Amino acid sequence: SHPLELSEKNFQLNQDKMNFSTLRNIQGLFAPLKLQMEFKAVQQVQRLPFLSSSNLSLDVLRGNDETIGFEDILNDPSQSEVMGEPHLMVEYKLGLL
Amino acid sequence: GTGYDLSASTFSPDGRVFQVEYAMKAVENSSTAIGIRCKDGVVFGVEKLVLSKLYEEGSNKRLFNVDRHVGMAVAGLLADARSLADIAREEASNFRSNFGYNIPLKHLADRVAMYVHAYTLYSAVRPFGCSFMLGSYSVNDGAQLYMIDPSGVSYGYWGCAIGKARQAAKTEIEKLQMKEMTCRDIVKEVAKIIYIVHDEVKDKAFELELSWVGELTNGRHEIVPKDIREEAEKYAKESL
Amino acid sequence: MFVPCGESAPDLAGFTLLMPAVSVGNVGQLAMDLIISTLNMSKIGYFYTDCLVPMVGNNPYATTEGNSTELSINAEVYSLPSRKLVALQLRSIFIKYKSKPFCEKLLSWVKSSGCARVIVLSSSHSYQRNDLQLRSTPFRYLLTPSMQKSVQNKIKSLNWEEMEKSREFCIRIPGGGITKTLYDESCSKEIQMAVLLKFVSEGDNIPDALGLVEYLNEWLQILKPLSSRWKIPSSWRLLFGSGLPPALF
Amino acid sequence: RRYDSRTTIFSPEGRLYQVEYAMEAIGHAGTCLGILANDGVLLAAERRNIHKLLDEVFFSEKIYKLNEDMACSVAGITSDANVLTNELRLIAQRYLLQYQEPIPCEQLVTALCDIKQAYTQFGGKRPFGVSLLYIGWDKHYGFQLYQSDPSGNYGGWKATCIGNNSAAAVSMLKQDYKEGEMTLKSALALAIKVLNKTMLSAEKVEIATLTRENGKTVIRVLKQKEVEQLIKKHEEEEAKAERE
Amino acid sequence: ERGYSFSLTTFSPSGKLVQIEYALAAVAGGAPSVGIKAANGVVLATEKKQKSILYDERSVHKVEPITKHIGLVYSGMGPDYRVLVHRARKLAQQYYLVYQEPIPTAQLVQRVASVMQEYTQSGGVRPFGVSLLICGWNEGRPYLFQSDPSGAYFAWKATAMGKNYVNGKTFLEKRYNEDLELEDAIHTAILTLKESFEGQMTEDNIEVGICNEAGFRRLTPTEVKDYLAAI
Amino acid sequence: MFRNQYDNDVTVWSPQGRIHQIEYAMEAVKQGSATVGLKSKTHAVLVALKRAQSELAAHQKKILHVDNHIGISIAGLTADARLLCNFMRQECLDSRFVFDRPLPVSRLVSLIGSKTQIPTQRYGRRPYGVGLLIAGYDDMGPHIFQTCPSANYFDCRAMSIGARSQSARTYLERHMSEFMECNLNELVKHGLRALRETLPAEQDLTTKNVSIGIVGKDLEFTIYDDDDVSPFLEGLEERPQ
Amino acid sequence: SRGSSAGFDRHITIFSPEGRLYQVEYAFKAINQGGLTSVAVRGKDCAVIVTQKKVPDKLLDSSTVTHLFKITENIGCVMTGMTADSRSQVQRARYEAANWKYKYGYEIPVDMLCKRIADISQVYTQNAEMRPLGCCMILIGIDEEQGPQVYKCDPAGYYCGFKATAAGVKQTESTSFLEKKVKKKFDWTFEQTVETAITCLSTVLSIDFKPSEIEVGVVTVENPKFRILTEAEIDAHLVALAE
Amino acid sequence: MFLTRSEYDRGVNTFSPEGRLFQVEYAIEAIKLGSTAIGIQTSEGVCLAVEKRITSPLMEPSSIEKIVEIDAHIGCAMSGLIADAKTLIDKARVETQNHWFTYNETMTVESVTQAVSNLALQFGMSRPFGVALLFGGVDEKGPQLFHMDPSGTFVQCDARAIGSASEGAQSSLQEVYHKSMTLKEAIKSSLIILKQVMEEKLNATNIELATVQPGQNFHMFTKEELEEV
Amino acid sequence: SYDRAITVFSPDGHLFQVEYAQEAVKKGSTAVGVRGRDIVVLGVEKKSVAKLQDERTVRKICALDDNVCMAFAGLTADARIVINRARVECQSHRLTVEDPVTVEYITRYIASLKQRYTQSNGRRPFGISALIVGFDFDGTPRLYQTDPSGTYHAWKANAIGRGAKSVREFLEKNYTDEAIETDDLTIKLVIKALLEVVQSGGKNIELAVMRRDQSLKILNPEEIEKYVAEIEKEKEENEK
């Protein structure tokens, strides 16, 4: 489709890969290891996926707590127009589907 | 510290982490290794207890070559030591690829010490139960010796000893005045200290292991030749 | 039932009975070991019941080559007739629905024999302390109403802390085993009794035993007052297991 | 005990103790009442936030509007009730967007009870300590009244009560409710009588009614003057009855 | 007894959540805060925790602005307060971007309370040990809200929180009047703070902020000195 | 008595500086049957012993095939052996497909050790309860290796692992001075003599409970079983007693 | 993961009946495990940091023992507490400064760096998987519009700005001494600031100092780069006090 | 010298002081609550005999499907928790169908065995399965027989008995079995073993047989064929 | 002491949490199902009746599709979740392929969904049991039962819930080929089986009827009382 679809879909992953590669080259193997441990730990305390979360700790760790982008004001995910059944979404999150 | 010593993310009522202390206590279950820094090189020495006669000579060595110019001696749990040696090799190779010249010993020591420290913060992993020493020589920088313990702390030394009898070894090392000697003069002293520290009643037999890096080898880490090692062993035995 | 080692039961009248409880960390049992080893008491009988898991072994206080081959069972009675002291030791744990019958039988024997008073060494969980208990001493005590006035005067002089009540008021000792049942039955049967416990956590619990025995000595004065003094039994070896396998370190 | 620390444990006789403990949290909340009549539905609540230094800056407390045709009342934990009411509004709007017709009254209750049941089904989470009363109108069954509980159960009623002192109110409603022969005025009088027995001033109650006019649903909240009129009428009729 | 005191996602047999009560206990042991809503304005006051000459007087503040017409104060723990303040500022900016008008006070209070309600229903975290007083001016009408560690908010005319807040609320009940001016409100707030200071009150150990039709602002120490001298 | 708190997980250190779960996993090796490995100047030989259970209900494969010049034998759990065999086969296949050159045995053993060290430091996992004897031939000659549940490996001239393997080890260390000069037949006979020392002193080796695997300079790894073993067993003498 | 431990002082995310965090309070006690104390003083146009240097082993190379670090060209640091934790925080601070420079196009200020570190430290006290570091940071720098700056952050996530501060085993006596001196006099020259810091250390610890036992770093308006003094300069200052 | 409690049998990742995993052993012991099954390997074919237990006469004696048949000339038999075999069957069928769709021949019994054994080993589902399987079929190598237990690994055999009463069945089968026999002889032997193991009668509604041999495809015996014997 | 976790075996090979879920099932209202030559009947006991309740919202019999219907015993919210999932699955299958859904297919789907929730320690099983009846494409009646563990079977007549053993024994005694010849006799058999445990017949008995190529029909209290009166009359005649 549009050339911008794939770029916008996976922006955060590519940013993480670039920063992690630079950090590994400058400091060593321990710094990305610690960063990934912290991200995994804080990304584990949230609401069940059919409700709306806030991700306060993850935003504090990642540095997104004084920045607003186009993904924060356009097509607000809190007021989504489609939502599945609760049990189905929880099962899909765990990989059973 | 009963009641506060099951995780590495727990503090005791006086501000201690006891899992790291137990990991450091695990290093005294192994045999002694010493390292002496000289005027023109660094000499390593390890007493290796022989377990059986069915093993090939040169097996389960405790002196490694993490690069062409760096030597490494280990004590404690062996699998952890091998993993740390692989990590050190990766770091040296990455630095060589990025910058095009040999990594200084200080930067390698820091990069390995921080990796060791990263394992003392979470409850999902376990601290490393091992210690090791790094030695190098270069005409621009001279001799250098470092030591890292399971907590993640590294320092530079003039003479170091790790293992089950490190206190007696340090007492013997502190009466040498090694800042003016030569490597060939200190090989004999290292062998003598290893022989005087060993205990025969509990440990049956051991095989002495020696190596240096210095000016006489153009800054390369190598095993001591057989004749020099034999002469040093004879000198130590007749000194006993 | 108290079955004597010989043919006739000893005469106990006015004796002081010391006994542990099977509680968290085995602190009372370790303290009883320390006391029996240090004072060098002598076995006089057995307490044969149906309430503890059976176990057997050789002499736990061996010193010479002659007394090192004496069989021992899970419950034994030691006496020191010179100073009117008698001590009971339990070396195993309790089967289900068996603690109350054991307490009833033991207190019946205590009443029938003719002892003066009973002192119980116990312990309680250390993770159930509040903020006020977190900044105070870990030693507590209890007393029955029937205890003689001299004991209360001495304890008040010693500046000790009494175990707090819990919300008609009752006492709860989490992790204490049979201590609460013993206290309740002794209160209902008019027997003098004192309880001495400590807040502990499970692990290596030898310093806890040393602290508890010194705490008890502050009142009993069994040996010289504090101003290498307790004998460690020869059985206190290999408390962590066998040796270390080779080709690992 | 050993079977009441998680929501994912069955007791040996097949009971979930955490859910029952959660339902125990509703007996401390204020009283909520609901009555069904031939020409309207009623909702009467008790105000707990009574104090001299409190402000009044909102439409009402413990009574919320979900869409053009429905309203609810809550009892339990306020912070959980807020989440539940927001989710109810979202569900109704989604159904309207997809089907171009207003949602039936029972489907909304079922959809919220599914969410309430998921939080008892899955581990690591805590069940909601909230109970709700619903009133509304739709073209399939007319006026309706439902009730819900923390476990995820619901049912239809003609008169029910939740909150503090619910059993006495239920007994009185059972004694005094006439099926098929009651109007909005009778429902208001009965609600006043039952609340007066179970708990009276106009500052401690709040009443809302639902009705249909010219093919349009009207939702109102009564005023202080009307509440005082009802209270004084009840008082005078009680005095007249007891004088004989 | 203590089995239900450690876990956040565990109900007591009587249907109570105890860790939330303990978080409120953490709040009640903080520094006192006072808020008074008068006609044509609101006033917020608090007691400083840095009572020494070594501390710098312009580094960290307890009274903060969220928008041009919204302010904030707290009692409890400061580190939680900072992250809550940052999130509130971001939410206000998002609302302005979407709707092209300043956010109302009630909507911001609702959003913040929604963020705070989470962390009380999940395992592996703890609730925020802090309460907030929020003031604002909107549509020619002042506002005053309070938010709890559990996520519940109330609308007040005058309130006190922190240490010795029951006696402060009694004092406010005795002294508060409907037809009050902003200057008299500031006087009454300072008098309420003075009831439990336990020391000598100056302009270097209290902080005051006001809100009116011109927006929210924090008073300078010279103005506080002038107000104190008038007592 | 004080070990109960520190011997449930692999991520807990003891106050004495020990990890008891690794030492417990090292005990699972002694639940398997005995196996013996030895080498000469040209060949490396593995011999295995099968359980006395009737062949009717079980066809056990103690000796497995990994590559054209590497073979292993097992003592311990079977699932871990399967996983390790799959990993080794994949490594050898990838190396051959990328570079047309055999994978060195030392490199393979180093990879195995690195792989097995990881589950000893991470929560939610357990060590591998299996030990291996590895025989191979490469540019450096023949090799014998030993693998442990503790992620340790050794370079051996002759080794035996399994249940009641101390007798085999004693025999091997007593007769270890003649292995280099022997040919294939003498080497296999020495291996069989070492293996039969672990049996009660009335049984004897038969063609139903013995497996043999040989590799060499010109001989690929081959497994002899059932009736193929009889030409090796025919020359063996009777018991000394 | 592993699972929390029951008790009112054994897990990070459990409140006590009085609303306290005993694990945070215990992490505050790890700062005294080293046994050393440090002092930071702010002057009219300069800022200094002083700490003591203990080398107990004869066989240890003394040039590799230090507690003074350089974050950027214009920011200095002194760490007190656990050594490995201190070094890890130094590395993290350098990373955060690099991110700020890349994102905004100019060098990070001292207060902003301290606030970022405190924000990161706050997260460790609210999640059950990670633990706080047992160390405290003190930063100095020169601001273009404001001047000298002294900042400090602690394991709880709390930070502040000071005129003079101390940390370590003997923080309270140093705080009292500095409070008396500050209430007495202001407007110190560059010499007087070092004099005051060394006097505070040498009075709180009843020791006469040698040039090899202390470590001094300075920043000044004329030369805004972080600098570490040498033994000759330290001895010159010491004889200046002695006369 | 005191007696204390110690437990090692609550987690699937815990080793006993003598190197034993007790949860796997308990899962294996769970098999002995099932019904007896017999399998015999002969040069002419493979015969699978299974036991069907009926709790009530009102139960329909046709929905108890214990001998499920997979394609590529492969049989099966089961004992234990019947609800646990569905994922294994689905994996086997999907693998076989993919092999057909990609190569256009039959996958070997050993290959399907290994493929289904890979999925049973993923508990290190968070628990081992509670069922045991028996596989049959013929290929270019000839007839083959395999057995699996809840430990997650397979093993080749030629005469195996699984179920609640399996030791006696194995003892009898060891005597009866011979290196050479006819397929009908094997069927008769299986029937007599089932007869002397069962506690009830043996009408055509109690058992279920599916003898597979290289001549034709899968052939589960019908009611008439079963009643013939 | 092996009943605290879902995925833990006991020393003799039992999973106790699933058995406790079965215990939860064993306390619901009794449900009875009988299949005949051209009709299938379902009957459910009504535990109690409140006068101020709308009875339409508490029914225990539902219709999954046009050729299948279901009754349950156990917890009610779990049953509602399962019913909604099955209905959505039937609708999706009918939309994708125009063929009518098979009763065995929907039973297998329900059983698989139930069995999914007994595999992990992070979720709990469904505490319900279901009875499923319907007609296939060729008009063959069917009757199935499902369990909380995930097993299923096929029956001719079965009962679940509280007091199920006596009902099952009565059905075993009285289920003959001459008792299901006609629809009225089948319905009378179902009512008579339910009357063994129900205190007052008709007052608190709910019954549903399904015929071939016809929609589900719920009998009214008038018809139920007429059938009860016929049973009473025949009992009086047979008294003698």
Numbering used by the authors:
A (entry chain H): 45 to 141
B (entry chain F): 5 to 244
C (entry chain J): 1 to 167, 176 to 235, 243 to 264
D (entry chain B): 3 to 201, 206 to 250
E (entry chain A): 3 to 233
F (entry chain E): 1 to 241
G (entry chain G): 2 to 244
H (entry chain D): 1 to 124, 133 to 237
Extract from the study:
Dedicated assembly factors orchestrate the stepwise production of many molecular machines, including the 28-subunit proteasome core particle (CP) that mediates protein degradation. The CP is composed of four stacked α-rings and β-rings, each containing seven distinct α or β subunits. Unlike conventional proteases, the proteasome harbors three different types of active site (β1 or caspase-like, β2 or trypsin-like and β5 or chymotrypsin-like), each present twice.
Structure 2 is distinguished by the loss of PAC3/PAC4 and addition of β3, and it explains previous observations from genetically engineered mammalian cells that β3 is the second β subunit to enter and this requires prior β2 addition. The β2 subunit grasps β3 with both a C-terminal extension (CTE) and the β2 propeptide, rationalizing why β3 incorporation in mammalian cells requires these β2 elements. Extending from the β2 active site Thr, the propeptide meanders, forms a helix crossing β3’s interior surface and extends to secure newly visible regions of POMP that co-fasten β3 in the groove between α2 and α3 (bottom left). β3 is stabilized by newly visible residues of POMP (residues 45–61 and 114–141) in structure 2 compared to structure 1. Upon departure of PAC3/PAC4, α-ring stability may be alternatively supported by POMP bridging β2–β3 and the α-ring, as well as changes at the α-ring pore. PAC1’s N terminus runs alongside α1’s N terminus through the center of the α-ring until PAC1 contacts a newly ordered region of POMP and makes a U-turn to terminate in the center of the α-ring pore.
